[PDB]
Amino acid sequence: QVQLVQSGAEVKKPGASVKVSCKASGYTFTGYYMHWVRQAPGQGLEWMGWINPNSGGTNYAQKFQGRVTMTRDTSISTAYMELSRLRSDDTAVYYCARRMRSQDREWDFQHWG
Amino acid sequence: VFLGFLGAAGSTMGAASMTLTVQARNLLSLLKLTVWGIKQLQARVLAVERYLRDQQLLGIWGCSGKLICCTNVPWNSSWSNRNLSEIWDNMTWLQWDKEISNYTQIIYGLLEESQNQQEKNEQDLLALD
Amino acid sequence: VFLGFLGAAGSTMGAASMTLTVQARNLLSLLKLTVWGIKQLQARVLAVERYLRDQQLLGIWGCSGKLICCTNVPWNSSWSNRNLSEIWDNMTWLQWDKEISNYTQIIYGLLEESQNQQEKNEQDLLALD
Amino acid sequence: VFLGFLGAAGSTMGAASMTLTVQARNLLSLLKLTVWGIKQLQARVLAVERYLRDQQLLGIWGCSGKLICCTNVPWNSSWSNRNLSEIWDNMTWLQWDKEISNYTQIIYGLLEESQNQQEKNEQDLLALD
Amino acid sequence: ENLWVTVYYGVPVWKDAETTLFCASDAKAYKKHNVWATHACVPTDPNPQEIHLENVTEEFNMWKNNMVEQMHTDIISLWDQSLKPCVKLTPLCVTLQCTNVTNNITDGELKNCSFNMTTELRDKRQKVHALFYKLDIVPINENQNTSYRLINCNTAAITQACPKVSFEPIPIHYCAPAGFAILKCKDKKFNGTGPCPSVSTVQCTHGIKPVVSTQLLLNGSLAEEEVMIRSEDIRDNAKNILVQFNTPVQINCTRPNNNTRKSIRIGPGQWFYATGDIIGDIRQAHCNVSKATWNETLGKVVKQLRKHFGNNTIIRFANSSGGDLEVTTHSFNCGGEFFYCDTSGLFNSTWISNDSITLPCRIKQIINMWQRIGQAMYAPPIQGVIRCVSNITGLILTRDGGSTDSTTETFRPSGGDMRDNWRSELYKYKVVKIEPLGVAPTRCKRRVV
Amino acid sequence: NTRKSIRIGPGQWFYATGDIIGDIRQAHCNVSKATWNETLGKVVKQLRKHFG
Amino acid sequence: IHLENVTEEFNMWKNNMVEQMHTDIISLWDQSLKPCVKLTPLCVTLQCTNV
Amino acid sequence: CNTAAITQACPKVSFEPIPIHYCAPAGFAILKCKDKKFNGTGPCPSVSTVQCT
Numbered sequence A: 001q002v003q004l005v006q007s008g009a010e011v012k013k014p015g016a017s018v019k020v021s022c023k024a025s026g027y028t029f030t031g032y033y034m035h036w037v038r039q040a041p042g043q044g045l046e047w048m049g050w051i052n053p054n055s056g057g058t059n060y061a062q063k064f065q066g067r068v069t070m071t072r073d074t075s076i077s078t079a080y081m082e083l084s085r086l087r088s089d090d091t092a093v094y095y096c097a098r099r100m101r102s103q104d105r106e107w108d109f110q111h112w113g
Numbered sequence B, C, D: 001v002f003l004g005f006l007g008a009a010g011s012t013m014g015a016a017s018m019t020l021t022v023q024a025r026n027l028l029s030l031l032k033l034t035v036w037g038i039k040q041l042q043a044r045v046l047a048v049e050r051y052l053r054d055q056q057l058l059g060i061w062g063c064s065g066k067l068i069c070c071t072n073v074p075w076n077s078s079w080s081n082r083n084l085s086e087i088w089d090n091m092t093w094l095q096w097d098k099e100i101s102n103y104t105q106i107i108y109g110l111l112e113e114s115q116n117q118q119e120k121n122e123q124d125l126l127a128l129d
Numbered sequence E: 001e002n003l004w005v006t007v008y009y010g011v012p013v014w015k016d017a018e019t020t021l022f023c024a025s026d027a028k029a030y031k032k033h034n035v036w037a038t039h040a041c042v043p044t045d046p047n048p049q050e051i052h053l054e055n056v057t058e059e060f061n062m063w064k065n066n067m068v069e070q071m072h073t074d075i076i077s078l079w080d081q082s083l084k085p086c087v088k089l090t091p092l093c094v095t096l097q098c099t100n101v102t103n104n105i106t107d108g109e110l111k112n113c114s115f116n117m118t119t120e121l122r123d124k125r126q127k128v129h130a131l132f133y134k135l136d137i138v139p140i141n142e143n144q145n146t147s148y149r150l151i152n153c154n155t156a157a158i159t160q161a162c163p164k165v166s167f168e169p170i171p172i173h174y175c176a177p178a179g180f181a182i183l184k185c186k187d188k189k190f191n192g193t194g195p196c197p198s199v200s201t202v203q204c205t206h207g208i209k210p211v212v213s214t215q216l217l218l219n220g221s222l223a224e225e226e227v228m229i230r231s232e233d234i235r236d237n238a239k240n241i242l243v244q245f246n247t248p249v250q251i252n253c254t255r256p257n258n259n260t261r262k263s264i265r266i267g268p269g270q271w272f273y274a275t276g277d278i279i280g281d282i283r284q285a286h287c288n289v290s291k292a293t294w295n296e297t298l299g300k301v302v303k304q305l306r307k308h309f310g311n312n313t314i315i316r317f318a319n320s321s322g323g324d325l326e327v328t329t330h331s332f333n334c335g336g337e338f339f340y341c342d343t344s345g346l347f348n349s350t351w352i353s354n355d356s357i358t359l360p361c362r363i364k365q366i367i368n369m370w371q372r373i374g375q376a377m378y379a380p381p382i383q384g385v386i387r388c389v390s391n392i393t394g395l396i397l398t399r400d401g402g403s404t405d406s407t408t409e410t411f412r413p414s415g416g417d418m419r420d421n422w423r424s425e426l427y428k429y430k431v432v433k434i435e436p437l438g439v440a441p442t443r444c445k446r447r448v449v
Numbered sequence F: 001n002t003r004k005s006i007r008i009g010p011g012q013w014f015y016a017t018g019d020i021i022g023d024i025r026q027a028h029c030n031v032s033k034a035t036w037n038e039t040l041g042k043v044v045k046q047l048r049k050h051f052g
Numbered sequence G: 001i002h003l004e005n006v007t008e009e010f011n012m013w014k015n016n017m018v019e020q021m022h023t024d025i026i027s028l029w030d031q032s033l034k035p036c037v038k039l040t041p042l043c044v045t046l047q048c049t050n051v
Numbered sequence H: 001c002n003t004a005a006i007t008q009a010c011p012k013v014s015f016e017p018i019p020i021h022y023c024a025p026a027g028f029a030i031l032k033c034k035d036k037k038f039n040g041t042g043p044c045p046s047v048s049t050v051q052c053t
């Protein structure tokens, strides 16, 4: 019953910033990484980076290195994705994914927001 | 033909003595302060204590390696007056252990003194030359 | 020429069997509630459990005092068909124990029942007169 | 004639060696975290460890099941120069253990090497044909 | 031709097994009761017997090793046993009113915080002053005034560590009980997993010092011959990369502040040790690493990194871009104080085809190690000036990944777990159980008699 | 019911009862009367074996 | 059981039975007081007089 | 209240001393010296053995 709830639709100006919420439910929030994948309208999936709720250590992709800041709140079990300096191509649907419970490794996004 | 652990409990003493290896096998085999750990550890120690208790008697009786062991102690009629037919082919080890329970202590005393307490000294004197 | 504990682990089964005395020696030898004390206590009980387990099996097989012990069980060809030259002068005990692992449970059952479960009764009747 | 545990402590070695079974018997036999329970559990493991320590040494000496065991090690005159009459009919096991206490480790080292380390190989080669 | 089975007791046969390993330490006589050696651990043997196994090839897997999970649960369990009888600072969650201890400095990492505290008597309350670090204190209003509170009082409880125990790591030998053995891999060029050619057996492991570190591995065991690049999956960016050096690099860290211990009684027998006024100058802690040695050592690492990312490629090093607190700084303990050093100056190079480095360090007193959500420890003030010299022998790196076409490759330090510290000292060890029973057919039969 | 978590100390969290969302209805158990009567009868037949 | 012809050295001052028993009585005292009522709030300022 | 904590003894437990016998585990024995004129230290002529004090 893994539940991933994200924030509502956002409308921002180019160069401004936007912070996307992702509240998890149904499991131990501090035991699994949290990924972020966006998809432009009519395009494919694009991985942005994963964040470890334990220590907070993230792993932003080289494409967004220096623009995205991923934080988390252990008390409310919610990961955050903030993108600064929005460009024209950043219009996309931003999902937060989680690995499988099985196989003891990442890269198998079974649960999505 | 093997029945399992305690399979020959209701059989005759003669039929049960052919399956001594069955009871011999199944006789020995952040914080761990859990109630079950304390039990489990105390059960393993209690288990190996009872195992060495019997092996301790098999040492002083000269029957350490064998499962059936003949001795030098003559059977006194005061312990039981039954014949070999009435014991090995009509009685079970359960009702036999109940009939000798009043004398098992006396038998054990002669079982360690009459033979292996005397035989080892005679073995020393016979192998002296 | 001694190599040490498990020194002939990669040797042939014939060269490793000549040093069975080596592995036999190194097989047994305000508050004490420390995590290390609990670990030491559970390690000492764990050590004597595995030691007495091997001696228990050697006791019901009539091989208590010896390190190389012959038996009455005939070798079944279904267990392994290799020749004597192909086993003791070509294979190691590691890859040999992996090959017989599926039949070690059946062999042990026949190893205790065919002989020492039968021998003790035959020796009892041979010494009957 | 039995005196009790350690009854023959002050008698000669010849009179005390006839009661080896006496000392051999009394040698082994919401929260349980009480000071008395932890001490009791650690004492039972301590008891069975001292017992298996002596049995282990008797195993490498080929004397596992016997109470009086003869060997192949020749007695060196440097250990003691007394005669059999001056040892078994004048000394007790207490004062005798004090005199040879400086050589018990050397005797134990030779006791495992002179016989059972050599006999087992010769026992294998004599029963090889 | 007639074959019969024969019992052999003592056959060299072992199988992969996981058991409870116990402690082993040398006779270190001494100020005592350090957490790890604790009251009594088994004294190591005067002469260890390392026995080589000829023509023996054994599979190893440092990443699925069970020795790591045991040791990780032993350090944590040792920590709680040493904090149960110590004083809990639960009343120290009074609303603090602080100021700037910065000696009248215009345009500070520590604040002066005065508060009302309980006394030996219940009805009597006292007002005392104590110095605290800015990292251990957050404002209470953010509206904002100058009233503060402790960092932990909102999430976890706090317990003051006893001033007698020392946090200095001493060598620990993990030993296997009788009937079990540890197979050591003595291969000089052994990577993470796979078959080990030269395998020996030991009873206990070597003296492993449990050094709780981040990013940089201090007081570790060096790798022989060439430096080693160990990783669960080099093709995985989410998996950390454990690097072990061959030449040890030296790092000197000091806390120039000459702190003083201000003991204030907060209850019958309860003594809370606070920080008194620093005697002398206010100087933040730092660490010096030889730039000539670090650049040299870093170059020896990129030569082995190109063996797994192309003989010619772009390799750069940047500072940790993700995380907070202790995963973004080289955190470690030294003399009792917990340092938090910014390693931005160490990972600031780009590779293609005596002027030492200074690292700013910040110090805390309320720490949350090993993911412990619920228990926070207060390190009592270490009186005097602190100086320790360490050997940095390992690193914990992490790729950035992304949609790059294998043109450039960046590396960033991380420390998402503490089990990776112990794997750098347990990669060569492996626990197996000894099975001395083996049957084999021969031409010998037991005499019927 | 709803869980109204209120912090009562450093790390100590006391979980109290929030307002009931919806109607106020007391708990109950049902059980089939037909099945209960049948089982009750099968008992009293065995009870008469000890009371005539 | 009396042991004849046995002469043993004794030392009541280097006895280990005393050092263990002293640690036993002390350990029994703390275990019988841990579940009892602690009087830490009874440290209020007392205002007394003479009987 | 100025130096140490205080704990009220439960009114159920009693402080009356009752005889306590100290026993030896298996493999160990306690030797009692029955000498009437036995001082502190020294060899004891009359020596017996018991399992509990």
Ligand SMILES: *[C@@H]1O[C@H](CO)[C@@H](O[C@@H]2O[C@H](CO)[C@@H](O[C@@H]3O[C@H](CO)[C@@H](O)[C@H](O)[C@@H]3O)[C@H](O)[C@H]2NC(C)=O)[C@H](O)[C@H]1NC(C)=O
Pocket (backbone or CB within 6 Å): E168, E169, E211, E218, E219, E332, E333, E334, E335, E387, E388, E389, E390, E391
């Ligand atoms: C890594 O290893 C080094 C070297 O073993 C550790 O350095 C050690 O640091 C302690 C703490 O300062 C030294 O103890 C000191 O002793 C002097 C007495 O001369 C005393 O005045 C100090 O107050 C302190 O107690 C210790 O001597 C020193 N090691 C050696 C061999 O001298 C270091 O702490 C280890 N850990 C890390 C994270 O680097």
Ligand SMILES: *[C@@H]1O[C@H](CO)[C@@H](O[C@@H]2O[C@H](CO)[C@@H](O)[C@H](O)[C@H]2NC(C)=O)[C@H](O)[C@H]1NC(C)=O
Pocket (backbone or CB within 6 Å): E100, E101, E102, E103, E112, E114, E128, E129
């Ligand atoms: C921190 O605050 C305390 C007061 O709670 C200061 O203590 C006194 O400061 C005055 C000067 O402001 C001195 O004259 C006194 O000698 C200090 N001690 C006492 C007991 O009153 C303390 O100096 C402050 N520290 C800093 C660095 O500002």
Ligand SMILES: *[C@@H]1O[C@H](CO)[C@@H](O[C@@H]2O[C@H](CO)[C@@H](O)[C@H](O)[C@H]2NC(C)=O)[C@H](O)[C@H]1NC(C)=O
Pocket (backbone or CB within 6 Å): E258, E279, E384, E385
């Ligand atoms: C840190 O400060 C302490 C406290 O003043 C220094 O210890 C003093 O040293 C002087 C040396 O002239 C002695 O006269 C004092 O008696 C010492 N203080 C006390 C309280 O006894 C200490 O020297 C300073 N640290 C260093 C490294 O010098």
Ligand SMILES: *[C@@H]1O[C@H](CO)[C@@H](O[C@@H]2O[C@H](CO)[C@@H](O)[C@H](O)[C@H]2NC(C)=O)[C@H](O)[C@H]1NC(C)=O
Pocket (backbone or CB within 6 Å): E319, E320, E328, E344
């Ligand atoms: C890692 O290095 C970057 C280098 O830029 C640091 O980011 C700078 O931080 C300073 C301090 O406020 C700012 O003035 C700069 O504008 C920042 N630059 C960029 C590009 O963001 C960063 O702080 C370092 N990491 C940590 C944890 O401090």
Ligand SMILES: *[C@@H]1O[C@H](CO)[C@@H](O[C@@H]2O[C@H](CO)[C@@H](O)[C@H](O)[C@H]2NC(C)=O)[C@H](O)[C@H]1NC(C)=O
Pocket (backbone or CB within 6 Å): F030, F031, F032
């Ligand atoms: C308790 O609830 C169960 C729910 O399964 C009821 O059982 C169901 O009853 C309906 C009645 O229409 C049937 O359609 C289902 O097939 C039943 N399912 C099962 C698994 O039995 C049950 O009746 C309820 N208890 C009582 C006393 O009515």
Ligand SMILES: *[C@@H]1O[C@H](CO)[C@@H](O)[C@H](O)[C@H]1NC(C)=O
Pocket (backbone or CB within 6 Å): B007, B008, B010, B011, B012
């Ligand atoms: C039990 O009694 C029956 C009686 O017919 C006998 O045949 C059998 O051998 C006895 N023992 C068993 C079934 O173990």
Ligand SMILES: *[C@@H]1O[C@H](CO)[C@@H](O)[C@H](O)[C@H]1NC(C)=O
Pocket (backbone or CB within 6 Å): B075, B076, B077, B078
């Ligand atoms: C058997 O025991 C009785 C009672 O002690 C004794 O009188 C009798 O002589 C004993 N007989 C034999 C044969 O041991």
Ligand SMILES: *[C@@H]1O[C@H](CO)[C@@H](O)[C@H](O)[C@H]1NC(C)=O
Pocket (backbone or CB within 6 Å): B082, B083, B085, B086
């Ligand atoms: C053996 O004992 C039984 C029962 O006491 C008796 O019936 C029988 O006659 C005795 N003798 C023989 C030879 O069975």
Ligand SMILES: *[C@@H]1O[C@H](CO)[C@@H](O)[C@H](O)[C@H]1NC(C)=O
Pocket (backbone or CB within 6 Å): B098, B099, B100, B101, B102
């Ligand atoms: C053993 O003694 C009890 C107690 O007198 C007695 O009831 C029982 O019959 C005796 N059993 C035997 C076999 O003598």
Ligand SMILES: *[C@@H]1O[C@H](CO)[C@@H](O)[C@H](O)[C@H]1NC(C)=O
Pocket (backbone or CB within 6 Å): C007, C008, C009, C010, C011, C012, E053, E054, E055
């Ligand atoms: C290893 O191989 C060499 C060469 O065949 C051989 O002489 C030696 O006995 C072997 N040792 C082991 C332990 O396999």
Ligand SMILES: *[C@@H]1O[C@H](CO)[C@@H](O)[C@H](O)[C@H]1NC(C)=O
Pocket (backbone or CB within 6 Å): C076, C077, C078
């Ligand atoms: C030989 O092996 C088969 C299968 O393991 C077994 O069923 C059979 O009884 C064995 N035969 C003999 C004579 O041991």
Ligand SMILES: *[C@@H]1O[C@H](CO)[C@@H](O)[C@H](O)[C@H]1NC(C)=O
Pocket (backbone or CB within 6 Å): C081, C082, C083
């Ligand atoms: C035994 O060796 C012979 C060769 O001498 C071979 O033909 C035979 O197949 C071998 N037996 C086996 C493999 O079971």
Ligand SMILES: *[C@@H]1O[C@H](CO)[C@@H](O)[C@H](O)[C@H]1NC(C)=O
Pocket (backbone or CB within 6 Å): D074, D075, D076, D077, D078
């Ligand atoms: C006794 O030991 C000495 C010293 O090793 C040796 O020279 C002598 O031959 C030994 N004598 C006997 C009888 O063993």
Ligand SMILES: *[C@@H]1O[C@H](CO)[C@@H](O)[C@H](O)[C@H]1NC(C)=O
Pocket (backbone or CB within 6 Å): D102
């Ligand atoms: C033998 O050991 C005792 C131990 O007290 C010692 O006093 C004595 O000098 C030793 N004798 C020799 C010859 O080493």
Ligand SMILES: *[C@@H]1O[C@H](CO)[C@@H](O)[C@H](O)[C@H]1NC(C)=O
Pocket (backbone or CB within 6 Å): E099, E100, E105, E106, E107, E108
């Ligand atoms: C006092 O410290 C705060 C904390 O950063 C700082 O912002 C402020 O400037 C300091 N006070 C003065 C007068 O500079």
Ligand SMILES: *[C@@H]1O[C@H](CO)[C@@H](O)[C@H](O)[C@H]1NC(C)=O
Pocket (backbone or CB within 6 Å): E095, E096, E097, E114, E115, E116, E127
């Ligand atoms: C201490 O108590 C007094 C009296 O209530 C109050 O005026 C003062 O602000 C308190 N200080 C702190 C730091 O709470």
